[PDB]
């Protein structure tokens, strides 16, 4: 199945620039949906509230790093959204 002796890591820095993390255990064919989960567990921010930007390109979800051709140790600006109302299912 998912092969890859060595794993991939990236630096998730907040657009503002206050805190930076280093997500590990990443695959070249790893979907973005799986990535958010991490940033959502570390920064405790929903996968929809937290925004990911790379090279001035609003990173999309559903596709795999391969699709976007992401590099190893690539910095991606993280922009989270505020409450934005009590809106809740």
């Amino acid at each position: 199945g998912s092969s890859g002796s060595s794993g991939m890591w990236i630096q998730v820095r907040t657009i503002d620039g206050s805190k930076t993390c280093t997500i590990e255990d990443v695959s070249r064919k790893a979907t973005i949906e799986e990535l958010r989960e991490r940033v959502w567990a570390l920064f405790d921010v929903r996968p929809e509230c937290q925004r990911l930007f790379y090279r001035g390109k609003q990173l999309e979800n559903g596709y795999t790093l391969f699709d976007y051709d992401v590099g190893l140790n690539d910095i991606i600006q993280l922009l989270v959204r505020p409450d934005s109302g009590p809106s809740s299912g």
Side-chain angles (χ1 to χ4, degrees):
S2 298
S3 294
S5 188
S6 203
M8 166 150 148
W9 67 73
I10 62 157
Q11 289 202 109
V12 181
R13 176 175 182 156
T14 57
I15 185 86
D16 164 68
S18 285
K19 191 193 174 170
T20 303
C21 87
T22 299
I23 301 294
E24 277 194 77
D25 276 329
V26 191
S27 210
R28 289 88 270 197
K29 303 202 179 187
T31 41
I32 302 293
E33 173 175 284
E34 289 280 309
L35 271 298
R36 300 194 187 278
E37 290 180 303
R38 301 288 280 159
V39 181
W40 179 20
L42 270 86
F43 296 77
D44 191 32
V45 163
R46 276 193 270 278
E48 68 166 89
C49 271
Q50 61 202 20
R51 305 297 294 159
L52 275 63
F53 294 96
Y54 184 66
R55 281 195 82 204
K57 168 80 159 165
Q58 176 170 112
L59 292 180
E60 281 209 50
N61 46 94
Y63 73 72
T64 65
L65 298 186
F66 166 58
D67 205 284
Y68 270 48
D69 311 298
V70 176
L72 171 65
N73 191 247
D74 77 283
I75 301 165
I76 301 166
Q77 299 311 260
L78 160 65
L79 168 90
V80 308
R81 273 79 199 279
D83 51 296
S84 191
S87 63
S88 193

